[PDB]
Amino acid sequence: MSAVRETMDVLLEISRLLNTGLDMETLSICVRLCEQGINPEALSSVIKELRRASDTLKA
Amino acid sequence: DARSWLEQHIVHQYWTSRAPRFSHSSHLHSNLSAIWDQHLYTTDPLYTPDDKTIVTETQVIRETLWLLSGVKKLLIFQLNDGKVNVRNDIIVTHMTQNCLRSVLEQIAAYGQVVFRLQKFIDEFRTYQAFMWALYKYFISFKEELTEIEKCIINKDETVTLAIVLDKLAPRLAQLKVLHRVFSTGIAEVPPDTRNVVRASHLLNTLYKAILDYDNVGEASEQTVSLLFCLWVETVRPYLEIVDEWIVHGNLFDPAKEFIIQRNKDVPFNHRDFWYATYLKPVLKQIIMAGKSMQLLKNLKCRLYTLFLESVQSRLQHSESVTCQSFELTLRSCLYPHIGKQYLECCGNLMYT
Amino acid sequence: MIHELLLALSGYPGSIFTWNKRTGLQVSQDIPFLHPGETSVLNRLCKLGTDYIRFTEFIEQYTGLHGIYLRAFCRGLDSILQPYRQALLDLEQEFLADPHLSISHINYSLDQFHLLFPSIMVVVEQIKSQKIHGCQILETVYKHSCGGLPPVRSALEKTLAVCHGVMYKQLSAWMLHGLLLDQYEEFFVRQGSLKQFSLRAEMLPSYIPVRVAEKILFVGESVQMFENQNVNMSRTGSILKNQEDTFAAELHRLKQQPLFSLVDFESVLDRIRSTVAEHLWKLMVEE
Amino acid sequence: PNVLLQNLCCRILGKGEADVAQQFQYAVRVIGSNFAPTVERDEFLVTEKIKKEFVRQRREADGALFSELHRKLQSQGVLKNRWSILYLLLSLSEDPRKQPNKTSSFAAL
Amino acid sequence: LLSYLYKEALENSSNENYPVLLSLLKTSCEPYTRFIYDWVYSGVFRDVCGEFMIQVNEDYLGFRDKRYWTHGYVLISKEVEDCVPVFLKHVANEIYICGKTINLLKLCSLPVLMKYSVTAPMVSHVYLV
């Protein structure tokens, strides 16, 4: 548990600077899926459709 | 599921959009915005409906509480740390967008000063003592803030945007006459020599300001008390250098600047060197005392505590009813406080 | 949230109050349900937990560089944590009383420790970076207490008190019958009757004149020559004569104050010299 | 992985614990398709693109900062999937510029 | 151990750890001071139990002239007793020689402050026999 948390915290530093605009929890899921093998291009695409879908819904 | 539990026991999020949204109430005059928007959308052929962050009515007064003393606000845009302004998407349902902008722009410009005044806080001697006097008012100004915070958590809520707004008005008028003092206070950084004129002339701008407010006071004497707090704690090292210059003979100064251009002559053919600075009658008392202590520590042969006490004794009987008018009388008690020590020091000179 | 934050500030990490050994104890960025504004004031409270574990390692490292005024300086550092830890405990009983609280209340109560703690953190880093030890510890804290900020000028006098007390162990033994107990050469009286004992300047406080240093040398040198002969012919002793009992008392009173003044010290350098000054005159007639 | 992607959908929408089934079904489809990413593995190549992107939004101070963060990141844990995370973030970046339109009337068309 | 405990008694620099070790150092000196007075009021070093140098001294009936000319030192682990309250930098050498002359009458605050108050009884008894 110690090792994992310490990469994430360094990982959240980059995400807020680079302007990802994702949440903490969601990022951990993105990283677990990668380590289990996912394509990056597909993964961003899914995130994007979900993101747009949430904004429209609220209004 | 835990996410859903949080979402009900905490008020719904409005810094990120992923929480559903209220802006309903059963009164007829509280859905004013939905009515106002509708009007614009049919009258004006060219209307641009903004993308509005739905707020969360009368929680704008909680962001006024934080903003006026406390931390930088990352819920609203601040272009820099001396320019506070309010995002153009904040709506409260029981007013117009524009109407809303206008109350939040008054407190924004009043939180612009306390936030600017907070960047001066450094966690030489004169500046460190002016910092602890500004910082002292900030911990007593949050006492009233933490009171108004317990009012909104109490059920029923009570507060609206503008109802505790004329309650925090004495402090509001106190942080503005701080602004006039401070602009005149530090605004000597581009000026040449940072040495004695900055320190002297910020004690002198405090001195100039207490005449402008005390002698027109007695209808806001709230602002007279504040400028005198800032003076009694700013004058506190600058008098106690003069206390060490007599009862020990020599004084303490920074090793990178002077705060009074008090200098002692190491060879003996003159006593002390003077260089003019910025009150004016008190400066002559320093010359004559140092002349006499400078011989007596090389050749023996043959104040702050008192200030506070003469101030208090006027007070238990700023304005006073044992002095007229007003603050220069409590000061002229101090010119005898130096004087009772000063004449008997110079007494000892001729004795050797 | 409120009570769990109190444990972050007595130096105990959650995974929410994560400890990093670079930038310190910090709140983790944009965790679910934490207001933008509340993370900003929670971060000002975490700087008072960052310098607090940067202070408790500084005690345990040097108790239980080398020096014996360093560890007197550590019991100098534990005394400023004393009101901090009481104000964490007065938050603690309030948040057991009811669970609805604002973090503005901890912000209000612990700003007082946001202007003692930065001003003392420069003190311990300055000690460890010039590598200084000894009687120049007493000099190092003293001239900062000359400096601005009333909280800090009263504070550092309490830090002054405890290493001034280990300076005072040196001057009770050096005047007892002589013999300096420094184990790492830490004082201002050089180690030398068998060989002549002088003064060093590489340690010697700069508010105690060079001509005062010798006022302490010579009275100790005169009992240093009976440390040589035999301790029952002493002009001080501890059963033999009552000279030392009087000296100790004058010592105890000057010691027990958190500020040390030189005018009072120099009047009892007279009395420690003048009553045993006639002993050495009554030596060399019969010698 | 079924659980992880479903939880991914629920979290982003901030609600819907079996109502995001339709979005989920799509996501399972996209992921089940294949890609050939231009630049495949190798840590140097992705770091170089991130720095250029930083300069372009005029965030220089951030470009310099990130590079220390990258060395740090490595030190904390070493993967063979390191690159996939850094490329993922890269693509998923957001520009500060412009308003992102309305969604309060764009929903309706 | 007893000489090591006085060395830790000289480190009194956080003065809450010093009184706790004082309690220890003083209990440890109880058997020790028994071994001081047994050797100069009878002139025989006694110690068969515990280690503080185990000997009983060498008897001699061919000698008489100080009794012992060989038996080692009485404490031979430092070759003269050192660094326990009692000054011992002449006092351990003056219990030594008083031990000889009882064999010629009979048979054939500061750690330095308690050091110096015990020292002056102990120079006074060595001159008393």
From Swiss-Prot, chain A:
Keywords: Cytoplasm, Cytoskeleton
Recorded GO CC terms: centrosome; cytoplasm; gamma-tubulin ring complex; interphase microtubule organizing center; spindle
A GO BP entry: gamma-tubulin complex localization
Signal sequence residues: none
Localization (cell): Cytoplasm, Cytoskeleton, Microtubule organizing center, Centrosome; Cytoplasm, Cytoskeleton, Spindle
Source superkingdom: Eukaryota
Keyword presence, DNA damage: no
Protein task: Required for gamma-tubulin complex recruitment to the centrosome.
Family: Belongs to the MOZART1 family.
Subunit structure and binding partners: Part of the gamma-tubulin complex.
Protein's name in the database: Mitotic-spindle organizing protein 1
Span of the entire protein shown here: 8 to 66 of 72
UniProtKB/Swiss-Prot annotation, chain D:
Compartmental location: Cytoplasm, Cytoskeleton, Microtubule organizing center, Centrosome
Ranges in coiled-coil conformation: none
Family indicated by similarity: Belongs to the TUBGCP family.
Assembly behavior: Interacts with gamma-tubulin.
Task performed by this protein: Necessary for the recruitment of gamma-tubulin to the centrosome and for the formation of a functional centrosome.
Protein name: Gamma-tubulin complex component 3 homolog
Species: Xenopus laevis
Source organism phylogeny: Eukaryota, Metazoa, Chordata, Craniata, Vertebrata
Parent-protein residues present: 9 to 117 of 906
